[PDB]
Swiss-Prot record, chains A, C:
Protein name: Capsid protein
Subunit composition and interactions: Homodimer. The capsid proteins form dimers that assemble by group of 5. Twelve such pentamers are linked together with free dimers. The homodimers binds to the viral RNA via an operator hairpin, but also to many other RNA sequences in the viral genome; this interaction probably shifts the virus from the replicative to the assembly phase and ensures specific encapsidation of the viral genome.
Subcellular location: Virion
Species for this entry: Escherichia phage MS2
Pfam families, alphabetized: Levi_coat
Positions of the UniProt region annotated as Viral RNA-binding: 1-258
Length: 258, 129, 258, 129, 129
């Protein structure tokens, strides 16, 4: 699945005005998900749960994003990647910080472990870029030369790039985190489509709450375009000051779906 | 119209001791339909009725196939492909509309799923394929 | 040690807004410190004390920086470079103003004297650049041809470049001076790491006060990044309007540490 | 893993009448450890236990070395390298993490200090060195 | 000194229907230690203590290995290589001293056994490797 999100900057913003340059007022999120054709519905639900647990409040990645910070020796902590109601939970622990890339792995062999990597970089003069990667395995035992070894039959891949302007306030980053959390909430179109091996066509193409602010000040996005099969949601604003969501699904190769 | 259908045979395959759900084999159906531009909606309904009657239960053509013998927006919606009296039905759901080709896929693993495609194209000056 | 500081301009600033160009709103400080491998802890404490005495209030360099001025015939005065509680103090006196470079040396031979040099220049159309250099010797007696001569076994080098936009008010320069003074205050992470021949890893990587304004209006910086071993502190602001501190340490050559 | 340790011999050297603290000589330790990707955390604990037991006091290998004879974040933290019963201990502290190589250095002059480095690298498709 | 250690992973392998005890994979440890000829026995004891403290439980280096993570006559005698609280210990025994290389082997099949070697050699005029 290919997912794109566009978030506006709210601090010192004038409603309905012209604000230039464009790159100084908007934050960009790009997510790519690769799932092998052998995955069933239950595997897709586990992948969705891993994504929900990655961005849950109190975890390293949302804490780093919401405060414009990187990874340091106080938010580098172990967290529950996959929550299964207290039984069968999958947790990751800090394992590497070489070359400026923070890494987490699960308490398993290197061939059967869930993998999480995070990095930050000043990509441009006025932009900062987060790169986040997640790897989800399918564990199995495979016999080579008459001897059994633990392996993974296949791996599901998730990658995310997040670009933020330097003028963003901590509240703007909090808004970005809340939009990220509300995108993948259970019951919303995108996770429902992912869990059922399907797309967004006519009955799951409905408006939904993207940012939840306790009933007051909530942000709702509504369908606005369906050309070429790409689903698009916008909020009640001008196209230069609105939340934008786009989702599409295709078959990348003979073994994977993107 | 160019319409293609794929029917799989679901199974489990052992790759070096690893179990994977796959299809042992797949059956393919390809059909092409040409309609002249002069056709009225009544003519198109007649064509649809002829296509439906070609495969009604009890006719020679479906009876030959059923025993492997011979002769002796608002439209991209999920629909039932195989009807088995309400139990064991196969339902396909829309998946993609890239390059003007609409696709449907059953709610299963991609390796064991039914695939339906449909596309229209102006092949000639007076014919729509 | 390599140290970098970024200071925002506060006068006529709107909180949370977009202010362009970038070079018209930020001041830059870059410090390089070279210490020979033969220096012990006591030598490092003396170097730290020399740095603390260079930027102390009432001395020529902070007075020149805080008022946008250069070096003239009223602030060219002798000052205590190293304070040792009134006994063993090291003081420097004016000795040269040729080619537009102000120089101070201690009351010693040219081979055993502490050296201070300062210069200013209009480096760009809207930028002004200060270049400051300090040389700290290790005195010894060395026998050549059977005759004793006073020499220095090795010298520790400090260089600083400071870039300020022309739109900065005197209060902005005062803020820069206060941040410079608070960076090297005793008890803070960087001087503690320098005095102990170590780096900033996990236990000295703590938040600290960068600008002290008598309890009210103080500026505090907190850890935000640790990639590649470089320690980074930011204040509670957007990345375009915040105080930024970065520190790193490496081995430049076989005889020195930078 | 590639782990290196340096142990100096502290002394004073006279360069033309000038006293400088230096190391007369240094002893080097180089070790490389290879672990297959199939290893479980229990296997890694077993490997660590074997490494610890290789150098326990009273065993042939440490006893040969002790007499110069033969056979007849949250991890970059300071730790005790040489333990001497609480008096005369040698402690190293983190210094650098450039190019994926972590370094530790004892609180002394750089010329008379202990040096410890550790780095990991994927050397092969199935081995981690 | 040149010290090598091999840790196997015991398993059964089917060669054409025939069961044989083998090792699925092996982990290798190689270490080289250089000591100058001027070193006193106290210096050698300090080196041994530093080596022991490098791998004490709770330190960053053994903790990284234990979780597969990174940084974030009268001497040829049997000894315990892996200590597991008196139950499940691994003991090696001397096997060979050919070509100046001493060897130890655990009491098992040769294909599933731990291997330890140690050898000394005068590499340079002032260094013993």
């Amino acid at each position: 699945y290919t997912i794109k999100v566009e978030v506006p900057k709210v601090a010192t913003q004038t409603v309905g005005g012209v604000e230039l340059p464009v790159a100084a007022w908007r934050s960009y999120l790009n997510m790519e998900l690769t799932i092998p054709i052998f995955a069933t519905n239950s595997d897709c639900e586990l992948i969705v749960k891993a994504m929900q647990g990655l961005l849950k409040d109190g975890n390293p990645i949302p804490s780093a994003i919401a405060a414009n910070s990187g990874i340091y020796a106080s938010n580098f902590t172990q967290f529950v990647l996959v929550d299964n109601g207290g039984t069968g939970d999958v947790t990751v622990a800090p394992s590497n910080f070489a070359n400026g890339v923070a890494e987490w792995i699960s308490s398993n062999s290197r061939s059967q472990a869930y993998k999480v990597t995070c990095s930050v970089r000043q990509s441009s003069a006025q932009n900062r870029k987060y790169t986040i990667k997640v790897e989800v395995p399918k564990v199995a035992t495979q016999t080579v030369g008459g001897v059994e070894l633990p392996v993974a039959a296949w791996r599901s891949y998730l990658n995310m790039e997040l670009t933020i302007p330097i003028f963003a306030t901590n509240s703007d980053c909090e808004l970005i985190v809340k939009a990220m959390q509300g995108l993948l909430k259970d019951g919303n179109p995108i996770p429902s489509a992912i869990a059922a091996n399907s797309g967004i066509y006519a009955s799951n193409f409905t408006q939904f709450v993207l940012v939840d602010n306790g009933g007051t000040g909530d942000v709702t996005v509504a369908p606005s375009n369906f050309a070429n099969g790409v689903a698009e949601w916008i909020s009640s604003n001008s196209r230069s000051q609105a939340y934008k969501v786009t989702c599409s699904v295709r078959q990348s190769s003979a073994q994977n779906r993107k």
